[PDB]
């Protein structure tokens, strides 16, 4: 009787990359990198706000082309490339910081305060900001103008007796010509200073012809002030003031902003990318470096295969004529579909096959436990794509982003290589232990033929083979016959 | 007959560093850190432009001391420590951003435009910019001055009808005294506003006595504006305007800048460092953290050895008298020069040595494969060395670079240790596998003497030893003699 120990093999198999060999054929493998997106943004479980044709700053100021975004909350504000401004031309010095502040706040909650403007005409407007059939202005700003023929120096105050920060968004008007600074504001040169007990901002405006935009050659520079509890806002203006109508509530949370043209459809997904929502089961993704929510780490590799099975050594008709097969170290067994390791016997009663459940289950559980560890929640990050050229800060952000990508890609490559090598080693070790256990079970009743098979020198039926398989093999009831047939011709 | 299995050793071997011990001897190792440079910069395949005695901004503005750099293109601009300015004393607000912008553009290509400045005197100059025997100015700037006794409000425009971004470099002149201001620009205070449809820049010149530089106590503040296609540039000047004569073409590419004093010699190299060009075969380098082109990663470690061979255990005359030495368990073999593993036999016909080529080839292939994996293209990065003291952003850049260096050094240490340990454990495994194969071949006809040797209990000639070596050893034609000599005294 002969008992051969072998492992399974699949007809077709995957190719993985280990420490030494860059192409190792294994039975099964899994993809560790996500490179596909549905192209749509789910609205669960996060609050997604489609900005349509309005920027976050445009909704902050009160663009009349969209007042729907008034007093709204969001977890991710989605900016579309078709957005535009349809009001008085304006600019925001340090624009990105204000955008980040409003995005991270997450609430466009405007509360009006009782500002008193003595001696000036309120509710100014322009033909570039038509609110229907008449001339209007930003909803959250107040354009002050000379009342009668005098513009007094305005000195207004407002305390913060509450328990939250207040964001005051104000502005300074830069007229096109000196006829204007005088017609609107009497004084030839204005000045706007907004101060708190710890900081101040003073703006001396400008006179000059800017390019024609929506019929106005002037500009409006938008500034913001943060008032902490126990502080007081003081506004002193000689002229050229676009006063605030109130304050925006400021809160700290997980809110952020994103630029994408992807549609929004009803579904559930915890990871949002500009290309669309992607599943987060895989530890790595290769869709976009801009992510929101629980998202996989971005890598430069399109594919990365983790070895789930063992090495694949199939039958290729290399050797062995008319059957005549061998144990584990000749090839694998494509005919074993019950387990990873098994026995094949040829006794006087015939041939047969069986599977070893203990070693197969041990290998499977070890590989599954390794897989579980292999498979972060980032909400507000730095901007990663830029449409203009700025300089030092942009290069710094690009350098940081590239360094992070390179380090994470190296980590992913090293991790997958190490795991694949250890998987192969653990499978080979498991087969070695099975062979050793069979050898100690058989003792001097069998001999190793060098091809992964034991030649048993005593005749015993299928009950004997089952006893060897299950470990309940008594070598002392066969020692005399085995020794006689082994050492005495 | 005795057959012994052994592995080769070298008289002097390297000392490498693995997980277990920091000092373990290995027959052959390779250095993984490039710590030396040739001291010169190659001009291929990258287009290197030696700046000589001018900074990039000086060539941008057109200092008379090197109009050679007009309409120039580079892949890497080399800035020398001997660079100096020889024109009107000028300052560049936020100098680094403009320097990086021009360096990444890669071209000093100037296209003149038909600006019409009616009512002012053009082509102004100063004695600090001597263009030979006469007084000149920057070639790419136009110093406007009152014509007669009036300086009108200059309101000029220029659109973007092309498909590329235009870079307009202009300036504002801060005079030394009010007398000179009124003599040059009539108005007591000047005002320069340069605007596009989405941005603007206003400058109010201030008058003061700056330190005497090249005969003039005034200053020129240089500003830049980027005009995208479909945009227009409008310049409105009450006075104190250094007008632009045209625009610089803006390009996106792989150009950068570097500060180095190294010479440039005719050679080829894909990696450039301030200390010179270095080879890019090694994965790590310890020359400089500033690199251009395909360059190895900078690491803090001066040396890093990767084990190419296996443990080196030589003879040291400890045990074994009168040449009676044998086995791989005890030590290695210096007398083996044709293979890594092999056999030594002592039979009735004498002694002999041979090498087992299959295991040696397998080990060499595995080691070469793991070497190929160990063996990036960065062009424009952040500044790494600073000569001034600025603050926040400088510490931010230094922190980023330090973190990157530390992470990459840790990665290099871990990689070297892991690869060395795996190499040692795979060579030992190969030796053990060869021993196991020999034992399986020698079924019941030989026994292991523990020292790594097989005593064969039957006589056979050199053909028998060759048959054992090549795998074609039939144990059935020797069982009777071996058993008689082994088990029956």
């Amino acid at each position: 009787a002969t008992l051969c120990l072998g492992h399974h093999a699949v007809p077709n198999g995957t190719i993985v990359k280990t420490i030494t060999d860059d192409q190792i054929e294994v039975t099964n493998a899994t993809e560790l990198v996500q490179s596909s997106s549905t192209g749509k943004i789910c609205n669960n479980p996060h609050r997604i706000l489609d900005g349509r044709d309005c920027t976050l700053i445009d909704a902050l100021l009160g663009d009349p082309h969209c007042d729907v975004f008034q007093d709204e909350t969001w977890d991710l504000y989605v900016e579309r490339s078709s957005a535009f401004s349809n009001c008085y031309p304006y600019d925001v010095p340090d624009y990105a910081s204000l955008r980040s502040l409003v995005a991270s706040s997450g609430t466009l909650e405007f509360i009006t305060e009782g500002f008193t403007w003595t001696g000036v005409t309120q509710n100014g407007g322009s033909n570039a900001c038509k609110r229907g059939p008449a001339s209007g202005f930003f909803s959250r700003l107040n354009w002050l103008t000379k009342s009668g023929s005098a513009y007094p120096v305005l000195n207004v105050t407002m305390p913060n007796n509450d328990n939250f920060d207040k964001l005051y968004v104000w502005g300074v008007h830069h007229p096109s010509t000196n006829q204007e600074q005088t017609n609107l504001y009497v004084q030839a040169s204005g000045r706007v200073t907004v101060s708190t007990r710890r900081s101040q901002q003073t703006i001396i405006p400008n006179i000059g012809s800017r390019p024609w935009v929506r019929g106005q050659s002037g500009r409006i520079s938008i500034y913001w002030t943060i008032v902490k509890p126990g502080d007081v806002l003081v506004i002193n203006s000689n002229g050229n003031l676009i006063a605030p109508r109130g304050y925006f509530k400021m809160r700290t949370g997980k809110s952020s902003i994103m630029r994408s043209d992807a549609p929004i459809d009803t579904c559930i997904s915890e990871c949002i990318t500009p290309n669309g929502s992607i599943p987060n089961d895989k530890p790595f993704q290769n869709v976009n470096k801009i992510t929101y929510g629980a998202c996989p780490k971005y890598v430069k590799q399109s594919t990365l295969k983790l070895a789930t099975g063992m090495r694949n050594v199939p039958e290729k008709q290399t050797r062995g004529l008319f059957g005549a097969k061998a144990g584990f170290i000749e090839n694998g067994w494509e005919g074993m579909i019950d387990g990873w390791y098994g026995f094949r016997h040829q006794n006087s009663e015939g041939t047969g096959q069986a599977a070893d459940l203990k070693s197969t289950q041990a290998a499977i559980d070890q590989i599954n436990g390794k897989l579980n560890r292999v498979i972060n929640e980032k909400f507000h990050q730095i901007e990663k794509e830029f449409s203009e050229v700025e300089g030092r800060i942009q290069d710094l952000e690009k350098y940081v982003e590239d360094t992070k990508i390179d380090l994470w890609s190296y980590n992913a490559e090293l991790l997958v290589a190490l795991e694949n090598q250890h998987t192969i080693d653990l499978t080979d070790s498991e087969m070695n232990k099975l062979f050793e256990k069979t050898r100690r079970q058989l003792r001097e009743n069998a001999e190793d033929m060098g091809n992964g098979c034991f030649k048993i020198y005593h005749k015993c039926d299928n009950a004997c083979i089952e006893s060897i398989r299950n470990g309940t093999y008594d070598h002392d009831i066969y020692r005399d016959e085995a020794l006689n047939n082994r050492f005495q011709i | 007959a005795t057959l012994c299995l052994g592995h080769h050793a070298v008289p002097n071997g390297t000392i490498v560093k693995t997980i277990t011990d920091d000092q373990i001897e290995v027959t052959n190792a390779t250095e993984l850190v490039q710590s030396s440079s040739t001291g010169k910069i190659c001009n291929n395949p990258h287009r290197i432009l030696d700046g000589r005695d001018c900074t990039l901004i000086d060539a941008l503005l057109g200092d008379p001391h090197c109009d050679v750099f007009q309409d120039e293109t580079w892949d890497l601009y080399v800035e020398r420590s001997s660079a100096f300015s020889n024109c009107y004393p000028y300052d560049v607000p936020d100098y680094a951003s403009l320097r990086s912008l021009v360096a990444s553009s890669g071209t000093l290509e100037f296209i003149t435009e038909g600006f019409t400045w009616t009512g002012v005197t053009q082509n102004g100059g100063s004695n600090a910019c001597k263009r030979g025997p006469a007084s000149g100015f920057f070639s790419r700037l136009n110093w406007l001055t009152k014509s007669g006794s009036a300086y009108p409000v200059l309101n000029v425009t220029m659109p973007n009808n092309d498909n590329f971004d235009k870079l307009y470099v202009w300036g504002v002149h801060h005079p030394s005294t009010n007398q000179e201001q009124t003599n040059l620009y009539v108005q007591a205070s000047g005002r320069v506003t340069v605007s596009t449809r989405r941005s603007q820049q206003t400058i109010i010149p201030n008058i003061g006595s700056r330190p005497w530089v090249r005969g003039q106590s005034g200053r020129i503040s240089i500003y830049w504006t980027i005009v995208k296609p479909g945009d227009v540039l409008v310049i409105n000047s009450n006075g104190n305007l250094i007008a632009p004569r045209g625009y610089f073409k803006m390009r996106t590419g792989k150009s950068s800048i570097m500060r180095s004093d190294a010479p440039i010699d005719t050679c080829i190299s894909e990696c450039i460092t301030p200390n010179g060009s270095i080879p890019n075969d090694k994965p790590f380098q310890n020359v400089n953290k500033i690199t251009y082109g395909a360059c190895p990663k900078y690491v803090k470690q001066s040396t890093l050895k990767l084990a190419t061979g296996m443990r080196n255990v030589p003879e040291k005359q400890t045990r074994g008298l009168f040449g009676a030495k044998a086995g791989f368990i005890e030590n290695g073999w210096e007398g083996m020069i044709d293979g890594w593993y092999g056999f030594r036999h002592q039979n009735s016909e004498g002694t002999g040595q041979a090498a087992d080529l299959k295991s040696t080839q397998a080990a060499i292939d595995q080691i070469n494969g793991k070497l190929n994996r160990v063996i990036n293209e960065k062009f424009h990065q952040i500044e790494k060395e600073f000569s001034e003291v600025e603050g926040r952003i400088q510490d931010l850049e230094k922190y980023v670079e330090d973190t990157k260096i530390d992470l990459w050094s840790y990665n290099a240490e871990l990689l070297v240790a892991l690869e060395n340990q795996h190499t040692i454990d795979l060579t030992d495994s190969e030796m053990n596998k060869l021993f196991e194969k020999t034992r399986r071949q020698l079924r019941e006809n030989a026994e292991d003497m523990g020292n790594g040797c097989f005593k064969i209990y039957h006589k056979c000639d050199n053909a028998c030893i060759e048959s054992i070596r090549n795998g074609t050893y039939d144990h059935d034609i020797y069982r009777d003699e071996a058993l008689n000599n082994r088990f029956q005294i």
Partner: antibody, heavy 90, light 93 residues
Framework: LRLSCVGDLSDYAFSWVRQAPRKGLEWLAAIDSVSYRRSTYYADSVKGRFTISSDYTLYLQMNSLRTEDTARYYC????????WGPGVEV | VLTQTPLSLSASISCRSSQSLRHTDGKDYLNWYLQKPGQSPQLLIYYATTRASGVPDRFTGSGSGTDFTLDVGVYYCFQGLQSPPGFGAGTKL
């Protein structure tokens, strides 16, 4: 005589096949590998009165040949005739 | 013994065996070879299901037990489960 039966080592099994000009392929001989005692089998027609072959890849002659063995001989590799050679006319 | 039908073709070739060529391992012991005019026979299909690497995908064959089914040349079906292995008559296409 032999031919180029490669296009490595001797770990594989081998076979000798005969093709008459217009009679089709006929398997004659097969030599196993070392791992299975190199048990060699021969065709029932060539049986006994055969001409054995080996490797070091050629076949001998001067035997019970009855002028019927005039054909093209092919050296094949594997348990099955997987890799073939140009063959030699006889 | 193996019977190959049709003997002449003008795209399926059938090889039927008296004894089933399925082994206890679980693989059918049949190969399909192509002999081009004047050149050496080339492996097309091994184990009656698997396709040899490096051959055009135009060729596909399948079957079990006794029945197996499948460019100018002769097609041969070969068995290697019994002591006297042999090829078939050959289908000329």
């Amino acid at each position: 005589l032999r031919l180029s039966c490669v296009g490595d080592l001797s770990d594989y099994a081998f076979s000798w096949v005969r093709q008459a000009p217009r009679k089709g392929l006929e398997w004659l001989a097969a030599i196993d590998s070392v791992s299975y005692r190199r048990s060699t089998y021969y065709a029932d027609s060539v049986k006994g009165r055969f001409t054995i072959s080996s490797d070091y890849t050629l076949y001998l002659q001067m035997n019970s040949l009855r002028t019927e063995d005039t054909a093209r001989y092919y050296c094949a590799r594997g348990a099955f005739p997987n890799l073939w050679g140009p063959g030699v006319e006889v | 013994v193996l019977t190959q039908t049709p003997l002449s073709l003008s795209a399926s070739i059938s090889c039927r065996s008296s004894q089933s060529l399925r082994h206890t391992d679980g693989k059918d012991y049949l190969n399909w070879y192509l002999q081009k005019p004047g050149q050496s026979p080339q492996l097309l299909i091994y184990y009656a299901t698997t396709r040899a690497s490096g051959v055009p995908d135009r060729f596909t064959g399948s079957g079990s037990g006794t029945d197996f089914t499948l460019d100018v040349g002769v097609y041969y079906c070969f068995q290697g489960l019994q002591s006297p292995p042999g090829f078939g008559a050959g289908t000329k296409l």
